[PDB]
C-alpha cells in the first residue's frame, strides 16, 4: 500500500516542532485551507466592445470554478506575462490534488478606475459548463438568446463605480450533485456538464454606446478564494509539474 | 517461531473469503487499499421507486478480467484500465453472451439506476523465482479528466493509495472501492439527461512497475486474474430490459 | 426628532478588504445567496472525506526513483545521490522545450513555501526475490557543496551518518533523512521564475552497494529498486510564496523576443481608419479605437542612418482589413509625441514612403500623401486580429 | 569596563525628576521604542515609465528594511533636499546603535492624487538583499524573470486610488534567522544576504500603457515605523556623526 512503512531506520534525535512557524512567526500554516482563503488572480482582460451594446447587455461572462480558468498565456503578440511567467497559481495547484469539491467562492472583482459608470453583475447557475475548452472569460456580443443580456430571476448585484470600483462577491454552491469535478473537465455525460462550475457569472455596464468607448481596452482584474465553506474531497496524486525558474529568458 | 513441518497437506494456512455460492482463497495476505470511507445508502434522497439490493446474487465474485504478464512488458506499462461497472458487463459482452446469462448482472438488465460499493480482488500466480511488481489503482471519474493521459503513469498513481503485487511473493491485491461520484447514482442504460459514459465510475488500472526478471531459462511469464464482488448495492428504476442496450465495446 | 448635536466619528476610508489575511477574520461580502445567513451544507453522504492539511499531504509517499541494481555492481558502486530536500526531481522525457517533471507530493506542497524544515523519509522497495541477497549503505552527508558533491565514495560517506542494510528476507525498508542545518528552517530550492534566491539543498543523500548482489543462477542478476519520498513526521513548512511550479495542463510559454515588431500594448486590435489630424482623415491610419484620437501607437523602429524601413505583417490573415487587408505599413511619429502606423497598399508604397520620410521628407509632402491610402479605402474597417507581429522591412536609403 | 564608575564626586543637590516631561508635557519620552513608532520618510521618487508596461508589471520595487534605504541625496541636477539637507532621520539614527533587530514594519505609502488608477502591492520575502548597494528603490523594466511582474503566492494588497490614494501596509517578520543585521550590510555569506531585509516590497499600477503616461513623474512618498513588535538587540556604539546645521549654505 502507498502509506505503509515496512521498517523505520531512525537516526534522528527528536527535533523540536515549530508548530508550523507558530513558534517563530506566530502563526500556523499546517491548515492548508486557511491558506486557500487568501485571494488569487483568477483572470484578466481588456474590455473590448463589439456591437453597440445596449444597457441590457452583459459586457462579458465566465464560468465560476475553483479549478481556475484554463490558463491564458495570452497571444504571442500580447502575452499575459503573469500566466506566461508566473504559471498557474496556488489554489489551482492544490486543486490538482483532488477529484471533487463542494462549497463556495469569493471573488472581489476590480474594475478600471477611470470610468464612472454603474456596474451590474448577474449570477447564472443555470448555465452548464461544456468541455474544458471555454472554461474561460468570454466577451458576449450581439444578443440572440437571453445569455447576452441582464436577466431577471438570477441573483445579481450592482456596484457604483463612482462610489467604488471594486465589487466583493460571494458565490453560493448550487448543484444537484453530491460534489463537482475538480480536475480539468473533458465532459462526457451531458449531465456531467452541470457538474463542474458553480454556474456562470456575468457582468455588464449600464453605459450607453456613446459613453461605452471610454471603457474600451480598460483592464479588469478578477480575484478569488474559496470562501470558507469550500471542501475538497477525494485525494488524487499530482500530474507532472513544470519548473518555473527553469522557464526561458526573454533573450536580448 | 519457525520449525517448518510441511505435510502432505502442504504447510501454510489458507485464508477463506466466502460470499454467496462463490468462494475463493489465497495463501498470501491481501494488500488492501481503501480509497474512501464507506458510502451512505442515499436511496432516501432520490427514489420513490422500489429499491433493492440483490446480495444473494450481486455479491457473488466474478471474473471480469484476466491476462498474461510477460517479462517483456516495459517498466511503466499498463496491463489494464478497467472502468469497473462497465467492464463487469463489457466482459460478459466480450464473452459474447447476454447480460441476463450471468446471475450477477441480471438486475442491470432491468433497473435503470444503480448505486453501491465495489470490491476487487486481483489474484496472481507469479512464480517465486520470478521478480517484478504491479501497482493497482482505482481512479474515480477518470474519463472526466482530460489530462489523465499525462497522469496515467506509475509515478502518478503512486502518489495516491494503491495496492501492490510483488511477483516474488505472488501476493494478492485486495481493493475496496466504495461508491463516490458527482451524482449519487449510475444509470444502467441511456437516460434522458445523459447517455455517454454510461455506468462509468472511472477506472481501476494496473500499470506495471518492475518488469518480470528471472534467470533467462526461468518461467518467462505470469498470469493475473481479477474478481469483483459488488456488495452494499442498491438498484432502482424498474424498466423493461428492452430499453437496456449493450455496453460500449471499449 | 431631537437633533443629534454630538460630534461625528472620524475614520479613514479604504477601498478594499485585506487579501492576504485568511484566518480569525470575518470577511464581509455581497452574497448572491438568497438567505441572509445561509451557508453551504454538506449532506452526510457528501461529507468531506479529506481534511486538507499540509501534513496530511506530506505524509504520502510518491514514487520518485527507479534504480536498477545489477549483480555486477562493485561494492563501492554508487546507486544514486539525490539531494536531501523535498524538491527531488523526476524528469519526464517531455519533448517540449519545457520538460515536465514528476514530484513527490511533499515536494509539490513544499514548492508553495519559502521555508521548510524537519526530517524526510525514503521508503526503499527492493523488488527482489528472497533468494537474492545483498547489502547497501544509504548514508547522509550534511553540508555538501557541489564541488564536494563529488569526491564521494561510500567510505567517506561512512564518516557521516549512514545506514547499512541487508537484503535477504524482508526486501524493503525506510530510511529517515535527518534535518541538519545551521538554519532553523530552510529556503526553497527554486522560486518563481527568478533564478537568484534559489538556494540549494542543505545536504545530500547517497546510496552505495555495500555488498554486491549475489543472486542464484535461477534468478535474475538485475534487481529493480524503487525510492519513495515522503514528508517525515517532523516535517513542516511556513512562509507561503509563489509556487515554483506549474501544472501540465497548459505547458505553453511565450518568449518576449524583441525582434518581432507590433503595436504598443493597449493599442490592439487596430483597424485601418481615419483621423482628422492626419491628412484631415483623407487618408487611412490605424486606430485602436473609434473615438477621436484613438490612433494605434507604435514602437519606434531603430533605423540606422542612411537607411529606411517599413512594416509588413507576417500574417495577412491577422491584418486589419479596409477595402484590402493591410499587410504593409509605415510607422512614423505623430508629431504629437508618438508613432502612428500608416497602412500602405504594398511593400513598395511603404518603401517609397520610407525613401521619403527617412529621406527626411515630411508626411505633409505630396510624395507621402500620394502614398497615403485614401479614406474611401477604409471599407469595412475591420480590426487587426489581436496584435499581429509585423516584419520589419528594412532597406538602405 | 565601560560602565564602571570608580568614584563619584557629587556636588549636586537632588534634582526633581521630570519623569521625562510627564511632569510638564504630560507624556513620558524615556521609552525610545514608542518614539520609534512615529512614522518617518523612507523614500521618495517620481514615477518613470520605461517599457510600455503590461498590467502585470510591478512599477517599482524596494527592499524593506528598518535600517533605512541607502541615503539618496539625489542627482546634483535634482537633489532630494530632504536627504541632501535633513540628513538621514531618526529611526535609522537609532538603528545605528544596534547590530540586530527582530520584528515588523509599518509603511503607509502615499500615491499621487491626480491618478485614479487602482494599485496593487506585492510582498516578496523570497528576495535576498545583496550588498548595501541596491538597498534602495528600483524601477523595474522589461520582464525577464518573474521579478518584474505581479506574482501569485506572495501576499499582496490593492488600494483603490479613486477611493483613496494612500495604502497602509504592515510587513510581517519572515526569516529563517534568529534576527537580522542592522548596520549597513556589505554581505559576505551567501546566506547572509537573506539575513537583512524583511523581504522585498513591490508596487504596480493596473494602468495600461495608453493611460500610464499620466502617471509619469508623479511623486510617491513612502513612510515607515517599526510596528510595535520590532526589537533591536545588541548594543553597538555610534559611528561618527555629521552635524547638520554645519552643512553649507546654497550660496548666492
Coordinates of N, CA, C and O in Angstrom, one line a residue, chain B residues 11-93:
Chain B
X11 N 1.6 -26.9 3.9 CA 2.1 -26.3 5.2 C 1.3 -25.1 5.6 O 0.7 -25.1 6.7
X12 N 1.3 -24.1 4.8 CA 0.8 -22.8 5.2 C -0.7 -22.8 5.4 O -1.4 -23.6 4.8
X13 N -1.2 -21.8 6.2 CA -2.6 -21.6 6.4 C -3.2 -20.9 5.2 O -2.6 -20.1 4.5
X14 N -4.5 -21.2 4.9 CA -5.2 -20.6 3.8 C -6.4 -19.8 4.2 O -7.3 -20.3 4.9
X15 N -6.4 -18.5 3.9 CA -7.5 -17.7 4.2 C -8.7 -18.0 3.3 O -8.5 -18.3 2.1
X16 N -9.9 -17.9 3.8 CA -11.1 -18.1 3.0 C -11.6 -16.7 2.7 O -11.1 -15.7 3.2
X17 N -12.6 -16.7 1.8 CA -13.4 -15.5 1.5 C -14.7 -15.8 0.9 O -14.8 -15.5 -0.3
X18 N -15.6 -16.3 1.6 CA -16.9 -16.7 1.1 C -17.8 -15.5 0.9 O -17.7 -14.5 1.6
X19 N -18.6 -15.5 -0.1 CA -19.7 -14.5 -0.3 C -21.0 -15.3 -0.4 O -21.5 -15.8 0.6
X20 N -21.5 -15.3 -1.6 CA -22.6 -16.2 -1.9 C -22.1 -17.6 -2.1 O -21.2 -18.1 -1.4
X21 N -22.7 -18.2 -3.2 CA -22.2 -19.5 -3.5 C -20.8 -19.5 -4.0 O -20.1 -20.5 -3.9
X22 N -20.3 -18.4 -4.5 CA -18.9 -18.2 -4.8 C -18.0 -18.2 -3.5 O -18.4 -17.6 -2.5
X23 N -16.9 -18.9 -3.6 CA -15.9 -18.8 -2.5 C -14.5 -18.9 -3.2 O -14.2 -19.7 -4.0
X24 N -13.6 -18.0 -2.7 CA -12.3 -18.0 -3.2 C -11.2 -17.7 -2.2 O -11.5 -17.1 -1.2
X25 N -10.0 -18.1 -2.5 CA -8.9 -18.1 -1.4 C -7.6 -17.7 -1.9 O -7.3 -17.7 -3.1
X26 N -6.7 -17.4 -1.0 CA -5.3 -17.2 -1.2 C -4.4 -17.7 -0.1 O -4.8 -17.8 1.0
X27 N -3.2 -18.0 -0.5 CA -2.2 -18.4 0.6 C -1.7 -17.1 1.2 O -1.6 -17.0 2.4
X28 N -1.5 -16.1 0.4 CA -0.9 -14.8 0.8 C -1.9 -13.9 1.5 O -3.1 -14.0 1.3
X29 N -1.4 -13.0 2.3 CA -2.2 -11.9 2.9 C -2.4 -10.8 1.8 O -1.5 -10.3 1.2
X30 N -3.7 -10.4 1.7 CA -4.1 -9.4 0.7 C -3.4 -8.1 1.0 O -3.3 -7.7 2.2
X31 N -3.1 -7.3 0.0 CA -2.5 -6.0 0.1 C -3.6 -4.9 -0.1 O -3.6 -4.3 -1.1
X32 N -4.5 -4.8 0.9 CA -5.7 -3.9 0.7 C -5.3 -2.5 0.6 O -4.3 -2.0 1.2
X33 N -6.1 -1.7 -0.1 CA -6.1 -0.3 -0.1 C -7.5 0.3 -0.3 O -8.2 -0.1 -1.2
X34 N -7.8 1.2 0.6 CA -9.2 1.7 0.6 C -9.2 3.2 0.4 O -8.9 4.0 1.3
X35 N -9.6 3.6 -0.8 CA -9.6 5.0 -1.2 C -10.6 5.9 -0.4 O -10.3 7.0 -0.2
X36 N -11.7 5.3 0.1 CA -12.6 6.2 0.7 C -13.4 5.5 1.8 O -13.6 4.2 1.8
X37 N -13.9 6.2 2.8 CA -14.8 5.8 3.9 C -16.1 5.3 3.3 O -16.6 5.8 2.2
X38 N -16.8 4.3 3.9 CA -17.9 3.6 3.3 C -19.1 4.6 3.1 O -19.4 5.5 3.8
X39 N -19.7 4.3 1.9 CA -20.8 5.2 1.5 C -22.1 5.1 2.3 O -22.5 4.0 2.7
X40 N -22.8 6.2 2.4 CA -24.2 6.2 2.9 C -25.1 5.8 1.8 O -24.9 5.9 0.6
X41 N -26.3 5.2 2.2 CA -27.2 4.5 1.3 C -27.8 5.4 0.3 O -28.1 4.9 -0.8
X42 N -28.1 6.6 0.6 CA -28.7 7.6 -0.4 C -29.9 7.3 -1.1 O -30.3 8.2 -2.0
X43 N -30.6 6.2 -1.0 CA -31.8 6.0 -1.7 C -32.8 7.0 -1.2 O -33.7 7.4 -1.9
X44 N -32.7 7.3 0.1 CA -33.6 8.2 0.8 C -33.9 9.5 0.0 O -35.0 10.0 0.0
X45 N -32.9 9.9 -0.8 CA -33.0 11.3 -1.4 C -33.4 11.3 -2.8 O -33.5 12.4 -3.4
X46 N -33.6 10.2 -3.4 CA -33.8 10.2 -4.9 C -34.5 9.0 -5.5 O -34.3 8.7 -6.6
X47 N -35.4 8.4 -4.7 CA -36.2 7.3 -5.3 C -37.4 6.9 -4.5 O -37.3 6.3 -3.4
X48 N -38.6 7.3 -5.0 CA -39.8 6.8 -4.5 C -40.0 5.3 -4.9 O -40.7 4.6 -4.2
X49 N -39.3 4.9 -5.9 CA -39.4 3.6 -6.5 C -39.0 2.5 -5.6 O -38.2 2.8 -4.7
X50 N -39.4 1.3 -5.8 CA -38.9 0.2 -5.1 C -37.5 0.1 -5.3 O -37.0 0.2 -6.4
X51 N -36.7 -0.1 -4.2 CA -35.3 -0.1 -4.2 C -34.7 -1.3 -3.5 O -35.0 -1.5 -2.4
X52 N -33.9 -2.1 -4.2 CA -33.4 -3.3 -3.6 C -32.1 -3.8 -4.1 O -31.8 -3.8 -5.3
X53 N -31.2 -4.2 -3.2 CA -30.0 -4.9 -3.5 C -30.3 -6.4 -3.7 O -31.3 -6.9 -3.2
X54 N -29.5 -7.0 -4.5 CA -29.8 -8.4 -4.7 C -28.5 -9.2 -4.3 O -27.9 -9.9 -5.0
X55 N -28.2 -9.1 -3.0 CA -26.9 -9.5 -2.4 C -26.8 -11.0 -2.6 O -25.7 -11.5 -2.7
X56 N -27.9 -11.7 -2.7 CA -27.9 -13.1 -2.9 C -27.2 -13.5 -4.3 O -26.6 -14.5 -4.4
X57 N -27.2 -12.5 -5.2 CA -26.6 -12.8 -6.5 C -25.6 -11.7 -6.8 O -24.6 -12.0 -7.5
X58 N -25.9 -10.5 -6.4 CA -25.0 -9.4 -6.8 C -23.6 -9.5 -6.1 O -22.6 -9.0 -6.6
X59 N -23.6 -10.1 -4.9 CA -22.4 -10.2 -4.1 C -21.5 -11.3 -4.6 O -20.4 -11.4 -4.1
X60 N -21.9 -12.2 -5.5 CA -21.0 -13.2 -6.0 C -19.8 -12.6 -6.6 O -20.0 -11.6 -7.3
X61 N -18.7 -13.2 -6.4 CA -17.5 -12.8 -7.2 C -17.6 -13.1 -8.6 O -18.4 -14.1 -8.9
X62 N -17.0 -12.4 -9.5 CA -17.0 -12.8 -10.9 C -15.7 -12.4 -11.6 O -15.2 -11.4 -11.2
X63 N -15.3 -13.1 -12.6 CA -14.1 -12.8 -13.2 C -14.2 -11.8 -14.4 O -14.4 -12.2 -15.5
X64 N -14.1 -10.5 -14.0 CA -14.2 -9.5 -15.0 C -13.0 -9.5 -16.0 O -13.1 -9.1 -17.1
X65 N -11.8 -10.0 -15.5 CA -10.6 -9.8 -16.4 C -9.6 -10.8 -16.0 O -9.5 -11.3 -14.9
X66 N -8.7 -11.0 -17.0 CA -7.5 -11.9 -16.8 C -6.5 -11.6 -17.9 O -6.9 -11.1 -19.0
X67 N -5.3 -11.9 -17.7 CA -4.2 -11.6 -18.7 C -2.9 -12.2 -18.3 O -2.6 -12.3 -17.1
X68 N -2.1 -12.4 -19.3 CA -0.7 -12.7 -19.1 C 0.1 -11.5 -18.7 O -0.3 -10.4 -19.2
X69 N 1.1 -11.6 -17.9 CA 2.1 -10.6 -17.7 C 3.5 -11.1 -18.0 O 4.1 -11.7 -17.1
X70 N 3.9 -11.0 -19.2 CA 5.2 -11.4 -19.6 C 6.3 -10.5 -19.1 O 6.0 -9.4 -18.8
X71 N 7.5 -11.0 -19.0 CA 8.7 -10.2 -18.6 C 8.9 -9.1 -19.6 O 9.6 -8.1 -19.4
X72 N 8.4 -9.3 -20.8 CA 8.6 -8.4 -22.0 C 8.1 -7.1 -21.7 O 8.5 -6.1 -22.3
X73 N 7.1 -7.0 -20.8 CA 6.5 -5.7 -20.6 C 7.4 -4.7 -19.9 O 8.0 -5.0 -18.9
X74 N 7.6 -3.5 -20.5 CA 8.4 -2.5 -20.1 C 8.0 -1.9 -18.8 O 6.8 -2.0 -18.4
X75 N 8.9 -1.4 -18.0 CA 8.6 -0.8 -16.7 C 7.2 -0.2 -16.5 O 6.3 -0.8 -16.1
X76 N 7.1 1.1 -16.9 CA 5.8 1.7 -16.7 C 4.8 1.3 -17.8 O 4.7 2.0 -18.8
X77 N 4.2 0.2 -17.6 CA 3.3 -0.4 -18.6 C 2.0 -0.7 -18.0 O 1.9 -1.6 -17.1
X78 N 0.9 -0.2 -18.5 CA -0.4 -0.6 -18.0 C -0.6 -2.0 -18.5 O -0.1 -2.4 -19.6
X79 N -1.4 -2.8 -17.8 CA -1.8 -4.0 -18.3 C -3.3 -4.0 -18.5 O -3.8 -4.6 -19.4
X80 N -3.9 -3.1 -17.8 CA -5.4 -3.0 -17.9 C -5.8 -1.7 -17.3 O -5.3 -1.2 -16.3
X81 N -6.8 -1.1 -17.9 CA -7.6 0.0 -17.3 C -9.0 -0.3 -17.3 O -9.7 -0.1 -18.3
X82 N -9.5 -0.9 -16.2 CA -10.9 -1.3 -16.2 C -11.8 -0.2 -15.6 O -11.7 0.0 -14.4
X83 N -12.5 0.4 -16.5 CA -13.7 1.1 -16.0 C -14.5 0.0 -15.3 O -14.7 -1.0 -16.0
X84 N -15.0 0.2 -14.1 CA -15.5 -1.0 -13.5 C -16.9 -1.4 -13.8 O -17.1 -2.5 -14.4
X85 N -17.9 -0.6 -13.4 CA -19.2 -1.2 -13.6 C -19.5 -1.5 -15.0 O -20.1 -2.5 -15.3
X86 N -18.9 -0.8 -15.9 CA -19.0 -1.1 -17.3 C -18.3 -2.4 -17.7 O -18.9 -3.2 -18.3
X87 N -17.1 -2.6 -17.2 CA -16.4 -3.8 -17.6 C -16.9 -5.1 -17.0 O -16.7 -6.1 -17.5
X88 N -17.7 -5.0 -16.0 CA -18.4 -6.2 -15.5 C -19.3 -6.6 -16.6 O -19.5 -7.8 -16.8
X89 N -19.9 -5.7 -17.3 CA -20.8 -6.1 -18.3 C -20.1 -6.2 -19.6 O -20.4 -7.1 -20.4
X90 N -19.1 -5.3 -19.8 CA -18.4 -5.3 -21.0 C -17.7 -6.6 -21.2 O -17.4 -7.1 -22.3
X91 N -17.3 -7.2 -20.1 CA -16.6 -8.5 -20.1 C -17.5 -9.6 -20.6 O -17.1 -10.5 -21.4
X92 N -18.7 -9.6 -20.0 CA -19.6 -10.6 -20.4 C -20.0 -10.5 -21.8 O -20.1 -11.5 -22.6
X93 N -20.1 -9.3 -22.3 CA -20.4 -9.0 -23.7 C -19.2 -9.4 -24.5 O -19.4 -9.8 -25.6

